[PDB]
Point group: C2
Chain length 153, copies 2
């Protein structure tokens, strides 16, 4: 049983707390928590490569992509490791997060510990937006909040 945690903070109203739990060494990871201060709708939700917060989220680098794939959604075969799709905020601006993912890991080459979790301004189009950028980033706009994923008890 391995656990991780991430506090999401930014320059504006967006903040949250995200927990990760992996029961078995190469098993699925449960992702749960809450993010507040959002606009109602979909917000892109990504693990970026670097746990570099020195310039806030500006510093986090590209999507975590150890297997040199293209951008997609979490249910796609063709995805980056860090492609966790979207979270959904309600009209109160709160997103209750509840994800199970079998590509991210809390150990080894797919490990996300020490990387940056980012929530975005816009929806991630999951590689289905109709331009070149869709296949790289998903066109999810500004980085509203982020944090470094840390080992938890």
């Amino acid at each position: 049983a391995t656990k991780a945690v991430c506090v999401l903070k930014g320059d504006g109203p967006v903040q949250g707390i995200i927990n990760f739990e992996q029961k078995e060494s190469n098993g699925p990871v449960k992702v749960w928590g809450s993010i507040k201060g959002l606009t109602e709708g979909l917000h892109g939700f990504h693990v970026h490569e670097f746990g570099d917060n020195t310039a806030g989220c500006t510093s986090a680098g590209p999507h975590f992509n150890p297997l040199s794939r293209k951008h997609g959604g979490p249910k796609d075969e063709e995805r980056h490791v860090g492609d966790l799709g979207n979270v959904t905020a309600d009209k109160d601006g709160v997103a209750d997060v509840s994800i199970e993912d079998s590509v991210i890991s809390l150990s080894g080459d797919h490990c996300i510990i020490g990387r940056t979790l980012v929530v975005h301004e816009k929806a991630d189009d999951l590689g289905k937006g109709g331009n070149e950028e869709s296949t790289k980033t998903g066109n999810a706009g500004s980085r509203l909040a982020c944090g470094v994923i840390g080992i938890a008890q």
Copy 2:
């Protein structure tokens, strides 16, 4: 080869950037950067076990101590992995950090990535304070600032 970074922030105005570089996994880690807003003198400087800053620096847990040793200074055989000693602030409140350490690592079970770096109120007594706490925490007082250590480019 390996690099890591950490932004230290407080509930007060203690701000720092700390870099880690390890040229090979069997080598020392160079720790460099700066911390401002400190009182003149010595401030304890630790890697705490958990990269959990959900409730600020308290969430970070005890000293990182994978080998089940007692507290010391970084030059001691008997130390925790996370025992990096003290940093020194000048009368301008700035500590310029320059450390080489052979016990922390950026890989393996002495790896510090995803853990919390903390700078303290007071001096760590390095195990040489004359009470039982000295052998556990070093009596360095409150956690002034902290952040989660992340993978860098």
